[PDB]
Structure formats: structure tokens, C-alpha cells
Design a protein around this ligand. Structure first.
Ligand SMILES: Nc1nc2c(ncn2[C@@H]2O[C@H](COP(=O)(O)OP(=O)(O)OP(=O)(O)O)[C@@H](O)[C@H]2O)c(=O)[nH]1
Ligand SMILES: Nc1ncnc2c1ncn2[C@@H]1O[C@H](COP(=O)(O)OP(=O)(O)NP(=O)(O)O)[C@@H](O)[C@H]1O
Ligand SMILES: Nc1nc2c(ncn2[C@@H]2O[C@H](COP(=O)(O)OP(=O)(O)O)[C@@H](O)[C@H]2O)c(=O)[nH]1
Ligand SMILES: [Mg+2]
Ligand SMILES: [Mg+2]
Lengths: 425, 336, 439
């Protein structure tokens, strides 16, 4: 009825899909060996959303996990997050494309989609209503941006009636591998924007700027930043198995968050902002985190919310708390700041309270915003791309790999049109 | 600098059996009046008259040669000056759109001797044989699209799926289309007869050859031995919005293309009004049908001619006021 | 003969129906099985039982309704809970997919395979209902399948029956409960199609129901188990007036006779007299004359508007419990002496008396009063022209730059049907000014 087939690819897709499962298996309280040990019926009726069925409180958690190089496939099968899922979804490749978007899309990456699409054709006929396709990948890599963007088109031309969202990861100059990728970026955005519905804009330019200043983690790893992004991805999908006053299914989330005919890159906020297990924090009071959702710093996308006029401000609350104070503290913003949220929607969505607390936080929150502050994550990519391109530098890594020189020009001009589309004030 | 014309189509035989009332009157050369039945709050029915003035208005007794002579015939002395020129076919479904552009619907076949494609491709060649323009030594080549499910197909080659890319000079180029070289007028009729036989169309009893795609026919005017483009005449037959009573037998396949015809025209409806006001970001890249039609509006050497098609009866009075209001908005446009 | 069939669809149609059929079966004294007690309850006595119900061949009583909803989760509350054996599974229709805050989905493309089954099964109710009195549909404005199925539903009954009237008791959401951003869109697309089919519409507005539960109950929790209590008491007013032999019968066509001056506007108000929550012991039971002196002055929080600056057209009261008729006509002389009651220039006529027998029965656990004095007037005003000016102002500015339009078009809507629905409501807003003319 309300079934979800999940898919992910790439190193960043696989270094968060393990982090995605460990958070939701402790907020729902799921045993990592395959079983379940919980108490509430809030966490028990909704077991058919992601998961299959088997006897003895066991199942197979279906999510297509694929990359060509076998070093990543052997790194997400070690721990208790390894034996949780189906071994027949072990879909790997022969030769990993070395951060080449071209080999992951046309020459080599367009070979083993038939070993991926055959898995999706069997996880579709077993369900009864498929209510989405989710995707986690990096926007500037190899098969994470090559194969992960191609598998959208192979399913969208076969299941066009399904709302598709992608958990996007913009790259950054500070945390960087295969140092130059505005070529890998805008080729991965151009086929994304033309083929998706919802797009969560996560960048490593803001996930490193917070840790340099607020959390004081000056030199972290990917896994320290994988912890930050895996806390929001449970704060988003808590409106899928924990119902409330805002029954906020993904198709209903699609209609309630997309004003203009083209998709836009969502800029989520966060709860009070620490790492795992860190003390020295106050009680998570409701009127305090209103300033922590509308902060100019607490954003999961490096932007400027003081200038970006709000369009959709749907923020999901989690934890047993007072319903009266939630309704009052939101009215200290639109009734005082007419430029931050502006006049497009009468009675815009501003709350959805969940009672089940996350694993480690009591009375937390999850801000999900969308505004014209996402100009600056289009101008900083394009200015780093137009310096790459008006001298035709590093052009020969794609032209000998079955590409076209003038496909850059559309994907350049498609991004410049987005910025001029955002000055609708 | 856009010329707008309107064409009332006559009443079919089946609409006489259902006793349909005709409400569209074309009394003069360039006027039209919509007679709208309205009732007041006390059940006292009255009648509204919606006057319109266009560049030229067509009756219901006009043939396709007269529609040609005032729409696409002046635009042939433009393609031989270096410019480019297009023409639309914009209206409700069933409103005679592919009867004007494609040809006279002769039941099981398509009499392509009529239509605006053939009558202009003939008139290029007569213009090309004048001694004033024979001196330029041009080569006429023709291509022919199809826009189905938002994607561009091809009809000269059988099913070549096509891409929509862009040059650095902000010029849309479908690539790689088939561009055959046309010898004479007996050659260009062989393209159109073979072209319409492969166009994707539904099969029912009411409209057995209803349009399901936005067909685009181009005639490319090239100098010999230069591989530039000196002129283009790009015909556009639309598919037409359909949302009145289309609930006959529509499965998951029928409304799959069905909601994508309507999606492609809202993107076309927005680019008209966005060009109406000023400085806004013109949403040309929403639907690919609007990306093809980009050079029609903002072209510096573009002279278009939209032919607004109108269903005549009472039950289509709602779509009629919708369709005529955009063509009046198309007429009141000054680009540059 | 005097039987009628109601229809309960949507999230605001079954949660109301879970507070109404419990409230209906408590007046007759009906078990959660549906068996009859020994209060001479073997066959219908002096009271007519089968207004909403039906006596089956098994001796017990069967209620008659239409339960259709897209989500199977709501009917699973009914197919497992209290009344899981009163309703036959033929009157329990569940869909699979969801409308999902979309008028275009719930209208036809999910109605392609349900209304061929609904019209098959209300035709089954032709042999079980020899005489029909009409229809009473419950749905919601501004939502998903409540606005989706409703405009489909009226088209398929007027071709089959036509002569039978229907009242809609509809809900659009609140600024306090704002479950979608397209709430002005889905509301105006079902006061378009239904406006040629609806006869009396009651705007049960959550923007003023919650203001009652804030002041009279001091409960700031907008829950659907306490807000549906206040709504179902208003429906219980009309219920016993066609069920029990009251002192003055008010027929369905006779009630429409005084509330519908022109069939174009036909929007009366659900101005129920608000009461106080008695939690343990009441301090003073009010009388009949004390209600109507100050009933319509706080009954303006039913549609959040200002009747004291528009003009009235008519009024029809409806009493429950024990009310002496000679006590009624003393309080009406004071309010007629006042100039606040402003009618049109062409009808200064006062009201209509409707008196029933039984008090509004009370399910325990609620936060309402246990009384026997109940007054429910249902009047139509020309002051609600500016009530529709709010929604058109909430429809104009989501549409001047064509925001959210592609979601309806993406599921099969043309751009003209917006302006067709807007122009059919810009006339209706000017129809109330057309009626309220001093000539
Ligand atoms: N007062 C009240 N309003 C309700 C109730 N249920 C739904 N609503 C109203 O309905 C609106 C939401 O749209 P719905 O009619 O519920 O849509 P739906 O029937 O759930 O169908 P979907 O949106 O597709 O899930 C809100 O504005 C609510 O005010 C209810 O039980 N009581
Ligand atoms: N001016 C005309 N005189 C006589 N018959 C006409 C005229 N215009 C259209 N028709 C007839 O109308 C019918 C349907 O016309 P058609 O051109 O298919 O409308 P349409 O809008 O193009 N439908 P579609 O193809 O889906 O866009 C055919 O039988 C035509 O011959
Ligand atoms: N934040 C974050 N970014 C990552 C992670 N892993 C990879 N990336 C980003 O992804 C890019 C590398 O893409 P990758 O997946 O390795 O390419 P591929 O393996 O060839 O498909 C780098 O620029 C990183 O910024 C991760 O765990 N966290
Ligand atoms: Mg046609
Ligand atoms: Mg619902």
C-alpha cells in the first residue's frame, strides 16, 4: 500500500546509507541482527514502509546498494549494519571509474544497470503501491554521480507516476577528492533537475564551516560529517512512520513544498547543534530552538536566510512537548519579520509535532526550509565552472570518453537560468 | 511584431445529431463575437457578447488556400532575406488544428495536397525560381520533428530519439535531426505523406486521428558550399489542451500522454504573459516545446503567425473564451 | 417511504460519522452489537425508527450510510472498533491510492474505479429503500479526497435520480489547522462543480469551531476527538426532527423552502447556540428565553463573520428537549424591538418554530454539557459575501504569478478551469450584493 523502494550509489551514498540505518534502527529501536525489540505500537504498525516481511520478527530491509569498485562494497558489509540486509542485493562492478562521470554514465556505467534495474523490477511487483524512490549520492564524483543519475532516467521512463526525491551532496573546495569537479557537478545537476521532484541540498561547505566554528572540530573526517547528515535524514523521514496532525506523506510533501513548476533545492535546518554524546547543553526547550531554526548559521546548506525570502517553512518537531508554545513562538517571526517569510501562501505549514524522541535527544526539532538563499550555491558553482570552461581547461578527460563538447553549454546555461529565476521578488 | 489570425471551424455532422447551438459569429473581415448564454440570480437568462478584433479573421466557409494566403504566404518573402519565420496552430483539441496544418482529413487517408506545409514548400520553389533570388544559389532542405512525452522524436528516420542542446551563442539546436535535401515539390510531398503516416496518434470513433504530439516541420534554407543557415521556416502543429469531458476510456496510458499535453501548453501560456510584462525571467526551459519556440518570440529576425483555432458550438464556449484571450494577449506584444 | 440515505466520505466525513452514528444509536438505545433492549423495543412504537436506520430480517436494526475513503486506515478503525457489526461490508468501500491534497487525483483518475462500484451499490439500496427523502453528504472543502470525490459524486446521482435534494455539511480547514498549502484551490474547485447541484451548504469552519473550544472549554488542543463533538451536536438537531414525532415537523423540502430564496446563492449558516462545559455540576440551568436572547451573538463564531453589519434574509429555529411553546414567544419581542436584527427590504418576516421532544443525548467522556435546553437556529445572511472575499483574496495571490498550478495540470487540469472557477465565484460574491439592494 505505502511501500518504498530505496536506492543509493557511490562512496558518499554508501558512507551515509550505513549511517542512515543506524539512526533509524535506534529511533525505531530495531535489532541490527535482523530482528526487532521494541515496545510501542507507533513503531510496529508501519513496518511495511521500507521493510519486507518474514516470520520470527525478521525481514529483509530492501535498498539497492551499488558501486563498481569492490572496496566500498566490502566496507559496508563488516559490522552489524552488514548482515542486516539481503545478500542477493550485492550488486557490484568490475572496474571502478576513477572519479570519471563519463565512464559512470556512458561507457562502463551504462553496462550493469541491467543488473540493477532487474532488482528494481522484482522489488516493485512484490509491493502493491510504490510511493517513491529515494536516492543518496554525491553531486561531484564518479559512479555516485554517473550511475546514480542514470538510474533515475531508467526508472522515470518506466515508472513515471512515482514521486522521486534525492538526498543531494554538493561538493566543496575545503573537503575535496579529485580536486577539480565543477565538471562533475553541473553535469550531475542538469540531469537531476530535469528528472526529479524533491532535492535536499546538503553541502560540505556548510558541514565544515560549522565544525570549524561551532562544534570546534577543526580537522574532521567524512564520518564526522556523516554523523551530522544522518541526523537530519531521520528528522526528514520521521513523517513516514510516525504519523501526526500533519499527515505528511512524500507525495503530500511534494505538493506542499514545490511552488514553482521546476524543483528547487531544499535547505534544511537543525535542532541544538552538537556531536554525539557531548555534554554541556541545556534542556531542549521549545522557545529556544525557534532561534536555532531561523539562525543565519544553523543551516545544512551554506546560504543567506536573512536575504532569501521564504517560500515553504515546514518544520517537523519531535518529542513529547507542549502544543501551545509551538503555535506561539512561530508567531514571533512572521508577525515581526515580513521580509524573511513573504506573501505567497496564506497559512503556510510551520509545524508537525512527533512524540517519539530521537536516540540521544529529547524534544528535538527538524527544520526544512526552501527560499531564494539557494542562489549562492548556484553562483559559487558557476563561477568556479566558468573559470574552468572559458579557457576549455581539463576538457580532454571527457571528449575521448564518448561525450559532447556542447553538452557543457546547456548545463552551464541551465544553472544561470536558475539564478535569474530566483529574483522573483 | 506577431500577426494573429483566428479560424472558426464549421459544425460536424454528429454535432447536428446532438443539436448543438453555434455561438461564434464572424460578421466582418477582422472581427469576431462570442454569444455567451448567461443566467441571472433569479433564473432570468440573458446573453453576453464578447467582441474581438484580430489582424484577420476567418469564416467557417474558408478553405485552406485562403487561410494560407493570409498567414504563411507573406512569410515566404522573409526567409529569402535572411530571417526566419514560424507559425503556430493553437486551440482546443478537436478544433481543426491538424486539418489546417496537416491537410484535409479524407477519412482513412491524409490529403496532403492541402495544408500549410505543402502550400508553402511549393511557394518556396516558385520564389526560388525568380531571377532576383535564383542568383543567390541556395539549397532547400527539409526536416521534420515530433515532440512526444516531453521528448523530441524524429519522423524522417523512424524512431531516432533526439536531444535538445545549446550552442554558445544562445541558440537551441536539436541534434542530431535528419535533414534530407529536397530536389523539387514532388520530393517534399513524399516527406509529408511518409511523415504523417508515422506520427503517433490515438484511435477512437470521435477523432480517429487525433494529434498526440507537437509536430514541427522545418524547411532549412542553406547556401551551397557553406553549411550555414540562411533561413528557416518552422511549422508548428500543436496537440491542444483537452480537459473538457475527456473521460471516455482513458487508461493509465491515455492520461500519461494526456497530462503531458496539458503540461506542455501551460509552459507555453506562461511565456506569453511573461513576455507581456517586462524584465522577468522568461521560463523557456520548463517544457521542451517552449525551448523550441524560443526563437519565435525573442528572435531579432523572427516573424511569426499564430492561427487560433476555434470550436464553434455551445458546449465549447468555455474553451473558446480561454483560447481567444491568449491570442489577443499574443497580439499585444512588443518584444524589441 | 420516509427513508433517506446519507453519505460519509473523507477524513472529515468518517471522523464526523464516528461521532454521529454513536450519537444516533444512543437516542434509540442501541447496543454496540445492535440488539434491542426491553423498553418495549420489539418493532417500531410511536416513534419512527427507520429515518436513518433499517430493520433487517434478523430482528435487529441496521444503519444505512455510504462509507467510502481512499485510505484503508480509517475504515480499519470502523471495521475493528465499537460498531464493527452494524455496517455490512457492502457499505464499506476502501480505496488503495491516496488523493494527497490534490483535487485532480480524487476527482476522476482514482474515481475511475470506485464510482463504478459505488453507483452499483447505491443501486443495491433501491430495493431496501422503497421511498427516498434525499441525501446528506459529509465531506471537506480545501482538502484531498473530500473535495475530490464530492464533485464526482453529485454528477452521478443527478443523472440517476435528479429529483432528490442533498445538503452538504462541509468543512474547510483553519489557519490553526493548516494541513495543505493548496487549501484555497481545492475549496473553490468544489464550490464550482457543486454550486449547480448543492441546495443548502453549511460551512462548518474550523477557524471558528476552535475559537469556541478555546473560550467555552479552555482547551487549546485542536484534536479531532473533541472538535468533532461540537460538530456532531449540530447534526443531531436535524436528526430527531425527522426521526421522532416532534411538536412541529420540519420537512426537508419545507426547510429548504424558507432558507433558499434564490437557488444560486443557497448558503445558510450553522449558527448553533453555544453552551458551557459542565465538568462536575452546573451552577444554573438556563431556560428557553435566556438562550435566544444571547444565542446568535456568540453563534457568530460558526462562520467567522459579522452578521451585525450585513442584512438577514430569513431564520429557522429548531428546539430539542422539553420546551413549552408559550414560553418561546416572550423573548422574541425584545429582539424584534432592537435594530440589530436587520432584514432585507422585501421580507421582514421573523422566523419558524420547530420543537422536538428528546434532549440531545450525551456520550460520557466528552467535555460538554448534560442539559435538556437546546436551541439550534439555521439562518442565511447577506453578510457572508465578505466571507467569500477572504478565500478569493487567498485565491488571487496564489495565482497572480501562477504558483502551484502545475500540480493540478500535471494530473490533468487545464489552465482555463481556474479562471472558469474564479469567474463563477466572482459572480456569486456579487450575487449577495445583488440581493441586498434597498429597492
Ligand atoms: N474539524 C475537522 N476537520 C477535519 C477532520 N478531518 C479532516 N478535516 C479537514 O480536512 C482538511 C484536510 O483535507 P482532508 O479532507 O482531510 O483530505 P483527506 O480526506 O484526508 O484526503 P487526503 O488529503 O488525500 O489524505 C483539513 O483542513 C481539516 O480541517 C476532522 O475530523 N474534523
Ligand atoms: N475548416 C474545416 N472544414 C471542414 N472540416 C473541418 C475543418 N476543420 C476541421 N475539420 C474536420 O474536423 C475533424 C477534426 O479536425 P482536427 O484537425 O483533427 O481537429 P484537431 O484539433 O486537430 N484534433 P487534434 O488532431 O487532436 O488536434 C476532421 O474530420 C476535419 O476534417
Ligand atoms: N560529506 C561527505 N562527502 C563524501 C563522502 N564520501 C565521498 N564524498 C564526496 O564525494 C566525492 C567523491 O565521489 P565518489 O563517491 O568517491 O566517486 P566514485 O566513488 O567514483 O563514484 C568527494 O568530492 C567527496 O567530497 C562522505 O562520506 N561524506
Ligand atoms: Mg491535430
Ligand atoms: Mg487523508
Amino acid at each position: 500500500m505505502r511501500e518504498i523502494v530505496h536506492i543509493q550509489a557511490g562512496q558518499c551514498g554508501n558512507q551515509i546509507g550505513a549511517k542512515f540505518w543506524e539512526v533509524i534502527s535506534d529511533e525505531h529501536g530495531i535489532d541490527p541482527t535482523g530482528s526487532y525489540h521494541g515496545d510501542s505500537d507507533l513503531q510496529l504498525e508501519r513496518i511495511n514502509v521500507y521493510y519486507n516481511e518474514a516470520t520470527g520478527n525478521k525481514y529483509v530491509p530492501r535498498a539497492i546498494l551499488v558501486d563498481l569498485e569492490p572496496g566500498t562494497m566490502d566496507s559496508v558489509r563488516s559490522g552489524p549494519f552488514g548482515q542486516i540486509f539481503r545478500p542477493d542485493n550485492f550488486v557490484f562492478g568490475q572496474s571502478g571509474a576513477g572519479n570519471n562521470w563519463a565512464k559512470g554514465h556512458y561507457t562502463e556505467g551504462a553496462e550493469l544497470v541491467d543488473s540493477v534495474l532487474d532488482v528494481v523490477r522484482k522489488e516493485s511487483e512484490s509491493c502493491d503501491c510504490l510511493q517513491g524512490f529515494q536516492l543518496t549520492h554525491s553531486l561531484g564524483g564518479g559512479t555516485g554521480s554517473g550511475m546514480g543519475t542514470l538510474l533515475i532516467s531508467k526508472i522515470r521512463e518506466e515508472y513515471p507516476d512515482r514521486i522521486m526525491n534525492t538526498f543531494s551532496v554538493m561538493p566543496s573546495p575545503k573537503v575535496s577528492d579529485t580536486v577539480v569537479e565543477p565538471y562533475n557537478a553541473t553535469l550531475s545537476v542538469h540531469q537531476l533537475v530535469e528528472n526529479t521532484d524533491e532535492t535536499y541540498c546538503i553541502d560540505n561547505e556548510a558541514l565544515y564551516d560549522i565544525c570549524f566554528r561551532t562544534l570546534k572540530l577543526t580537522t574532521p573526517t567524512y564520518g564526522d560529517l556523516n554523523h551530522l547528515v544522518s541526523a537530519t535524514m531521520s528528522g526528514v523521514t520521521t513523517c513516514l512512520r510516525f504519523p501526526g496532525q500533519l499527515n505528511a506523506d512524500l507525495r503530500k510533501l511534494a505538493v506542499n513544498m514545490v511552488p514553482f513548476p521546476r524543483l528547487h533545492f531544499f535547505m534544511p535546518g537543525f535542532a541544538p547543534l552538537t556531536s554525539r554524546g557531548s555534554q554541556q547543553y541545556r534542556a531542549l526547550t521549545v522557545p529556544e530552538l525557534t532561534q536555532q531554526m531561523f539562525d543565519s548559521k544553523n543551516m545544512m546548506a551554506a546560504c543567506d536566510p536573512r536575504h532569501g525570502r521564504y517560500l515553504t517553512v515546514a518544520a517537523i518537531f519531535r518529542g513529547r512537548m507542549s502544543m501551545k508554545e509551538v503555535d506561539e513562538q512561530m508567531l514571533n517571526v512572521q508577525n515581526k519579520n515580513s521580509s524573511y517569510f513573504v506573501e505567497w501562501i496564506p497559512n503556510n505549514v510551520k509545524t508537525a509535532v512527533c512524540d517519539i524522541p530521537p536516540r540521544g535527544l529529547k524534544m528535538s526539532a527538524t527544520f526544512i526550509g526552501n527560499s531564494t538563499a539557494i542562489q549562492e550555491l548556484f553562483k559559487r558553482i558557476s563561477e568556479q565552472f566558468t573559470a574552468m570552461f572559458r579557457r576549455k581547461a581539463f576538457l580532454h578527460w571527457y571528449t575521448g570518453e564518448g561525450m559532447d563538447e556542447m553538452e557543457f553549454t546547456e548545463a552551464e546555461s541551465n544553472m544561470n537560468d536558475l539564478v535569474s529565476e530566483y529574483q522573483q521578488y | 511584431s506577431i500577426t494573429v489570425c483566428v479560424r472558426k471551424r464549421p459544425i460536424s455532422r454528429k454535432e447536428v445529431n446532438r443539436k448543438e447551438i453555434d455561438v461564434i459569429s464572424v460578421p466582418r473581415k477582422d472581427m469576431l463575437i462570442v454569444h455567451e448564454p448567461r443566467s441571472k440570480v433569479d433564473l432570468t437568462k440573458f446573453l453576453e457578447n464578447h467582441k474581438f478584433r484580430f489582424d484577420y479573421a476567418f469564416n467557417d466557409t474558408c478553405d485552406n488556400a485562403m487561410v494560407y494566403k493570409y498567414t504563411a504566404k507573406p512569410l515566404v518573402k522573409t526567409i529569402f532575406e535572411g530571417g526566419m519565420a514560424t507559425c503556430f496552430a493553437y486551440g482546443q483539441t478537436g478544433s481543426g488544428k491538424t486539418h489546417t496544418m496537416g491537410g484535409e482529413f479524407n477519412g482513412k487517408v491524409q490529403d496532403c495536397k492541402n495544408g500549410i506545409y505543402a502550400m508553402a514548400a511549393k511557394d518556396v520553389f516558385v520564389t526560388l525560381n525568380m531571377p532576383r533570388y535564383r542568383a543567390m544559389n541556395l539549397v532547400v532542405s527539409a526536416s521534420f520533428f515530433e515532440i512526444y512525452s516531453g521528448k523530441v522524436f524524429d519522423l524522417l528516420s523512424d524512431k531516432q530519439k533526439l536531444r535538445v542542446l545549446e550552442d554558445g551563442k544562445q541558440q537551441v539546436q536539436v541534434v542530431g535531426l535528419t535533414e534530407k535535401v529536397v530536389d523539387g515539390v514532388e520530393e517534399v510531398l513524399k516527406l509529408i505523406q511518409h511523415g504523417n503516416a508515422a506520427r503517433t496518434s490515438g484511435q477512437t470513433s470521435a477523432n480517429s486521428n487525433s494529434s498526440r504530439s507537437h509536430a514541427v516541420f522545418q524547411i532549412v534554407l542553406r547556401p551551397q558550399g557553406s553549411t550555414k543557415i540562411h533561413g528557416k521556416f518552422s511549422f508548428i502543429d500543436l496537440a491542444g489542451n483537452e480537459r473538457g469531458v475527456d473521460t471516455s476510456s482513458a487508461d493509465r496510458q491515455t492520461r500519461m500522454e494526456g497530462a503531458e499535453i496539458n503540461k506542455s501548453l501551460l509552459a507555453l501560456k506562461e511565456c506569453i504573459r511573461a513576455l507581456g510584462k517586462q524584465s522577468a525571467h522568461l521560463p523557456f526551459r520548463v517544457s521542451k516545446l517552449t525551448q523550441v519556440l524560443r526563437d519565435s518570440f525573442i528572435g531579432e529576425k523572427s516573424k511569426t503567425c499564430m492561427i487560433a483555432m476555434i470550436s464553434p458550438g455551445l458546449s465549447s464556449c468555455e474553451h473558446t473564451l480561454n483560447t481567444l484571450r491568449y491570442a489577443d494577449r499574443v497580439k499585444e506584444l512588443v518584444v524589441k | 417511504m420516509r427513508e433517506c440515505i446519507s453519505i460519509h466520505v473523507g477524513q472529515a466525513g468518517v471522523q464526523i460519522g464516528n461521532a454521529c452514528w454513536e450519537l444516533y444509536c444512543l437516542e434509540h438505545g442501541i447496543q454496540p452489537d445492535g440488539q434491542m433492549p426491553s423498553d418495549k423495543t420489539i418493532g417500531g412504537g410511536d416513534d419512527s425508527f427507520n429515518t436513518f436506520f433499517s430493520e433487517t430480517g434478523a430482528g435487529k436494526h441496521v444503519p444505512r450510510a455510504v462509507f467510502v475513503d481512499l485510505e484503508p486506515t480509517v475504515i480499519d478503525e470502523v471495521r475493528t472498533g465499537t460498531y464493527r457489526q452494524l455496517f455490512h461490508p457492502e457499505q464499506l468501500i476502501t480505496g488503495k491510492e491516496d488523493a494527497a491534497n490534490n483535487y485532480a487525483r480524487g476527482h476522476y483518475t482514482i474515481g475511475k474505479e470506485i464510482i463504478d462500484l459505488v453507483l452499483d451499490r447505491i443501486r443495491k439500496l433501491a430495493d431496501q429503500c422503497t421511498g427516498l427523502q434525499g441525501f446528506l453528504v459529509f465531506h471537506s472543502f480545501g482538502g484531498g479526497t473530500g473535495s475530490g470525490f464530492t464533485s464526482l459524486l453529485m454528477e452521478r446521482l443527478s443523472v440517476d435520480y435528479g429529483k432528490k435534494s442533498k445538503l452538504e455539511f462541509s468543512i474547510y480547514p483553519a489557519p490553526q489547522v493548516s494541513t495543505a498549502v493548496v487549501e484555497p484551490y481545492n475549496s473553490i474547485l468544489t464550490t464550482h462543480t457543486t454550486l449547480e447541484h448543492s441546495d443548502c451548504a453549511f460551512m462548518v469552519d474550523n477557524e471558528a469551531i476552535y475559537d469556541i473550544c478555546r473560550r467555552n472549554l479552555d482547551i487549546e488542543r485542536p484534536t479531532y476527538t473533541n472538535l468533532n463533538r461540537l460538530i456532531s451536536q449540530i447534526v443531531s438537531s436535524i436528526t430527531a426532527s425527522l426521526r421522532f414525532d416532534g411538536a412541529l415537523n420540519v420537512d426537508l423540502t419545507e426547510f429548504q423552502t424558507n432558507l433558499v430564496p434564490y437557488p444560486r446563492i443557497h448558503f445558510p449558516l450553522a449558527t448553533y447556540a453555544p453552551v458551557i462545559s459542565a465538568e462536575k455540576a452546573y451552577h444554573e440551568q438556563l431556560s428557553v428565553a435566556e438562550i435566544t436572547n444571547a444565542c446568535f451573538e456568540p453563534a457568530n463564531q460558526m462562520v467567522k463573520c459579522d452578521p451585525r453589519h450585513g442584512k438577514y434574509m430569513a431564520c429557522c429555529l429548531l428546539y430539542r428537549g422539553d420546551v413549552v411553546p408559550k414560553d418561546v414567544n416572550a423573548a422574541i419581542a425584545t429582539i424584534k424591538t432592537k435594530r440589530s436584527i436587520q432584514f432585507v427590504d422585501w421580507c421582514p418576516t421573523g422566523f419558524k418554530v420547530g420543537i422536538n421532544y428528546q434532549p440531545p443525548t450525551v456520550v460520557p467522556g466528552g467535555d460538554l454539557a448534560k442539559v435538556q435546553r437546546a436551541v439550534c437556529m439555521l439562518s442565511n445572511t447577506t453578510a457572508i459575501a465578505e466571507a467569500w472575499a477572504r478565500l478569493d483574496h487567498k485565491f488571487d495571490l496564489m495565482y497572480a504569478k501562477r504558483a502551484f498550478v502545475h500540480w493540478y495540470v500535471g494530473e490533468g487540469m487545464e489552465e482555463g478551469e481556474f479562471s472558469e472557477a474564479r469567474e463563477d465565484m466572482a459572480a456569486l460574491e456579487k450575487d449577495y450584493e445583488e440581493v441586498g439592494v434597498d429597492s
